[PDB]
Amino acid sequence: EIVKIPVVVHVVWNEEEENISDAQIQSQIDILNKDFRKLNSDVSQVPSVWSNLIADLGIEFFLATKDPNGNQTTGITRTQTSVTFFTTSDEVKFASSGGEDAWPADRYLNIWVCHVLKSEIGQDILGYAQFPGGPAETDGVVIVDAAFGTTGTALPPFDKGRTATHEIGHWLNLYHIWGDELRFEDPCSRSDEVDDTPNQADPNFGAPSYPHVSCSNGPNGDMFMNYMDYVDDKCMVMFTQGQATRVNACLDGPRSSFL
Amino acid sequence: EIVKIPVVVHVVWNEEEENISDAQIQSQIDILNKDFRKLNSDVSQVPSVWSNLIADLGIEFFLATKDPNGNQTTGITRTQTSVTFFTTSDEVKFASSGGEDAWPADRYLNIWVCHVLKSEIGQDILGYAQFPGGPAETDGVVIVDAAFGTTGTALPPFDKGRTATHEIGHWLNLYHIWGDELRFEDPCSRSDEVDDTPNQADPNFGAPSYPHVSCSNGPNGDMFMNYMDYVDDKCMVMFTQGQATRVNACLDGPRSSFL
Ligand SMILES: CNC(=O)[C@H](Cc1ccccc1)NC(=O)[C@H](CC(C)C)[C@H](CSc1cccs1)C(=O)NO
Ligand SMILES: CNC(=O)[C@H](Cc1ccccc1)NC(=O)[C@H](CC(C)C)[C@H](CSc1cccs1)C(=O)NO
Ligand SMILES: [Ca+2]
Ligand SMILES: [Ca+2]
Ligand SMILES: [Ca+2]
Ligand SMILES: [Ca+2]
Ligand SMILES: [Ca+2]
Ligand SMILES: [Zn+2]
Ligand SMILES: [Zn+2]
Numbered sequence: 001e002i003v004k005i006p007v008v009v010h011v012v013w014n015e016e017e018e019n020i021s022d023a024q025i026q027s028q029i030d031i032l033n034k035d036f037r038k039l040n041s042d043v044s045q046v047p048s049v050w051s052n053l054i055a056d057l058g059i060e061f062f063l064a065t066k067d068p069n070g071n072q073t074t075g076i077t078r079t080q081t082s083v084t085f086f087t088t089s090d091e092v093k094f095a096s097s098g099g100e101d102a103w104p105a106d107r108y109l110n111i112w113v114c115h116v117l118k119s120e121i122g123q124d125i126l127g128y129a130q131f132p133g134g135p136a137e138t139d140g141v142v143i144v145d146a147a148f149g150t151t152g153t154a155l156p157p158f159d160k161g162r163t164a165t166h167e168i169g170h171w172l173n174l175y176h177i178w179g180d181e182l183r184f185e186d187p188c189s190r191s192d193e194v195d196d197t198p199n200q201a202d203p204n205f206g207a208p209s210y211p212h213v214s215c216s217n218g219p220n221g222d223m224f225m226n227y228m229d230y231v232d233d234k235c236m237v238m239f240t241q242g243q244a245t246r247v248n249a250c251l252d253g254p255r256s257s258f259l
Numbered sequence: 260e261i262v263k264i265p266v267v268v269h270v271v272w273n274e275e276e277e278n279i280s281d282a283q284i285q286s287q288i289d290i291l292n293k294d295f296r297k298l299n300s301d302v303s304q305v306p307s308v309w310s311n312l313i314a315d316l317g318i319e320f321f322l323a324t325k326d327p328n329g330n331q332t333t334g335i336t337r338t339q340t341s342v343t344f345f346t347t348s349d350e351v352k353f354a355s356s357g358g359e360d361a362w363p364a365d366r367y368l369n370i371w372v373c374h375v376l377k378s379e380i381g382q383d384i385l386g387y388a389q390f391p392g393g394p395a396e397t398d399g400v401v402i403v404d405a406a407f408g409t410t411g412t413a414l415p416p417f418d419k420g421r422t423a424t425h426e427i428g429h430w431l432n433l434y435h436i437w438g439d440e441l442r443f444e445d446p447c448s449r450s451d452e453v454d455d456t457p458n459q460a461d462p463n464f465g466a467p468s469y470p471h472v473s474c475s476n477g478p479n480g481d482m483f484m485n486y487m488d489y490v491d492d493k494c495m496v497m498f499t500q501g502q503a504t505r506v507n508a509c510l511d512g513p514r515s516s517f518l
Contacts, residue, residue, distance in 0.1 A: 089393035090349075097394040120390055121439050121449075131379050134348030135356035137396070180380055181442045184461045202443045 024152030031161030110140030129170030283411030290420030369399030388429030
């Protein structure tokens with residue numbers, strides 16, 4: 001009952017170095033096929049207290065072999081642009097705004113790769129996702145090239161393929177583990193809608209030491225090694241079974257076309 | 260030297276009550292032609308302390324009389340939908356996702372009106388904007404019908420037409436007055452890029468009393484009666500001259516097509 005998802009990678013490049021190699025792209029696909037099957041070896045990093053909660057999402061990914069017209073494809077498009085940065089406003093997802101149009105969202109997972117991404121207020125970001133239910137025109141994930149794959153332009157600490165794992169988590173209806181409070185809200189007040197992810201104050205960055213306690217969640221602390229936190233690639237290594245329930249409802253519902 | 264912006268309002272309705280009247284829509288236009296001209300009678304509410312800073316933005320709005328093909332229009336489209344809520348993912352801006360396609364962004368301000376709006380993570384919202392520079396397909400503003408205009412379905416405390424004023428402020432390149440810090444950041448660290456808006460910690464809600472001091476901006480405090488704060492309709496009544504400058508730069512640059 002493994003769900004196999006066809007992927008198209010849209011490389012959008014301004015300078016030649018940003019037109020990343022097949023090898024770099026393939027290395028990311030390989031990572032997704034580990035993380036989404038619980039075949040990543042660093043799963044051994046999960047605290048013993050949570051070692052029974054680790055999920056095999058039962059999802060695999062392959063670069064599409066047929067394009068939306070039925071013609072053979074490598075599963076990779078490559079589009080030269082004069083645009084120097086893209087934002088969460090989705091300019092990368094339309095040819096008219098210097099990016100590349102989405103392939104049918106009911107048949108493919110669209111991944112756009114570009115050099116520079118910013119939030120609306122100019123914060124540098126590595127990637128962003130569209131949750132299920134949105135318009136097909138902008139469905140998929142976007143990851144910057146220096147945070148994509150495990151070779152080529154990929155740079156530590158984002159050189160282990162986990163930005164894409166995190167964004168595809170969102171694509172499958174998963175929320176940030178800490179609940180996404182706004183600055184005026186109590187840091188312990190919001191939920192990620194998953195019971196087996198401990199309540200958590202804020203995102204964790206970098207390489208935290210276990211345990212990292214917040215919101216009176218001791219002695220075990222934050223599950224900062226979940227892909228839906230903000231830690232360095234080498235530190236995030238698992239989805240929970242509670243998260244798998246959400247992913248499965250997404251696959252059984254809004255993304256049933258992939259079944 | 261008044262800039263006159265042609266408007267199209269896309270009413271997207273599921274239940275007939277959401278198919279709002281011409282009068283309700285017209286009442287919103289009337290409000291915009293006041294707020295953006297410093298003609299709102301409640302501008303008198305601004306503490307005299309800042310009377311020197313209150314701006315006439317010199318912008319007016321009209322419902323388009325010609326559609327994108329040059330045929331007569333009322334400047335209002337009405338689209339029936341089976342969709343019961345829209346999100347910040349822009350479903351309302353595409354017919355394919357149960358909404359209505361944008362008119363050319365270089366010639367019209369697109370305003371969508373729907374019954375229920377949510378953020379990505381399910382928070383109820385009254386409206387949202389796209390900032391300049393984004394793809395034309397999604398350019399414009401979205402407001403919920405209960406927060407649109409001053410009659411019909413409009414409900415207090417969002418029955419003075421200020422949601423649209425706030426959103427159109429974003430459309431013209433204005434940022435939240437308090438700087439949009441993330442939960443974990445110093446609340447005094449970010450700027451709205453406007454000198455004459457006092458440095459402000461957090462958004463203000465409801466009906467604060469003057470003064471509301473934050474970030475050592477005493478004795479006058481936060482300019483919480485600015486349209487780009489988060490206070491009730493009845494409490495937001497002004498733009499500043501510094502904001503007028505940013506807006507003029509937007510019309511002189513990315514949105515010069517409207518000149
Ligand atoms: C060098 N850049 C980073 O490490 C930034 C830091 C940051 C955090 C919040 C806001 C702005 C910047 N983080 C990201 O890129 C996130 C992805 C992780 C897994 C690397 C990314 C943030 S997207 C948002 C923009 C605005 C609000 S949330 C995300 O959650 N995608 O789904
Ligand atoms: C009944 N609901 C409300 O009053 C919500 C409350 C709220 C605030 C922040 C996040 C989620 C909900 N406020 C809005 O709808 C804002 C408009 C005001 C002027 C009325 C609206 C929030 S859009 C965002 C979604 C996520 C992050 S910011 C806005 O700034 N548009 O430009
Ligand atoms: Ca969008
Ligand atoms: Ca949880
Ligand atoms: Ca939290
Ligand atoms: Ca300011
Ligand atoms: Ca602030
Ligand atoms: Zn994320
Ligand atoms: Zn706003």
